[PDB]
Design a protein around this ligand. Structure first.
Ligand SMILES: [Mn+2]
Length: 196
């Protein structure tokens, strides 16, 4: 619900979520649940990406300060939460500099280290169900798929995790916290059900 969302997410995320929402006619007002889902999905994207860089030796490394700067490239291109115009510019550009084929759907992320596109999903349902729902909708176009849930379970393509364990932890907790908060605010049930 809108008050809950506006209370529990930072302004950057709220800005982006509201934005992407003002494109299907829906508004946090009569669509609290969608607003929540988008907020969550977005936050997870940032959590996946922030503080992640690539070395001058090409290794991946996590750094608390976050600022880029010429010895450190950002590990990921955050595609989710940009304007579709910019998103596609980024996707198209990347496919240009490589042998990636332009994907049918916009991905959540791009990893410069593995040269993969990344779809991210968060679910209130199982994790298997969502994964196979996504995998199969995304068949062929090798995009790496990472699913999280609110019960702290998790499921990636072929079960390898290019994200460090700490960051995956951090995520799984956050989703957990959120689940509690929702429950104590009496919103968890309605939300859990509203999915699909
Ligand atoms: Mn997604």
């Amino acid at each position: 619900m809108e008050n809950f969302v506006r209370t529990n997410f930072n302004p950057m995320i709220l800005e982006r979520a509201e934005k992407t929402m003002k494109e299907y006619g829906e508004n946090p007002q009569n669509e609290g649940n969608k607003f929540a889902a988008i907020s969550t999905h977005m936050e997870v994207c940032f959590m996946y990406s922030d503080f992640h860089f690539i070395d001058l030796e090409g290794n991946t490394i996590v750094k608390e300060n976050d600022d880029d700067n010429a010895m450190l490239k950002h590990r990921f291109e955050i595609i989710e939460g940009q304007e579709r115009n910019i998103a596609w510019t980024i996707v198209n550009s990347i496919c240009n500099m490589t042998e990636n084929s332009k994907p049918r759907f916009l991905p959540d992320l791009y990893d410069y280290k593995t040269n993969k596109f990344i779809e991210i999903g968060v679910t209130r349902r199982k994790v298997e169900d969502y994964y196979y729902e996504k995998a199969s909708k995304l068949k062929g176009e090798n995009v790496y798929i990472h699913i999280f849930s609110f019960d702290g379970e998790e499921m990636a393509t072929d079960d390898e995790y290019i994200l460090d364990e700490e960051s995956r932890a951090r995520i799984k907790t956050r989703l957990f916290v959120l689940r509690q908060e929702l429950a104590t605010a009496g919103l968890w049930d309605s939300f859990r059900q509203s999915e699909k």
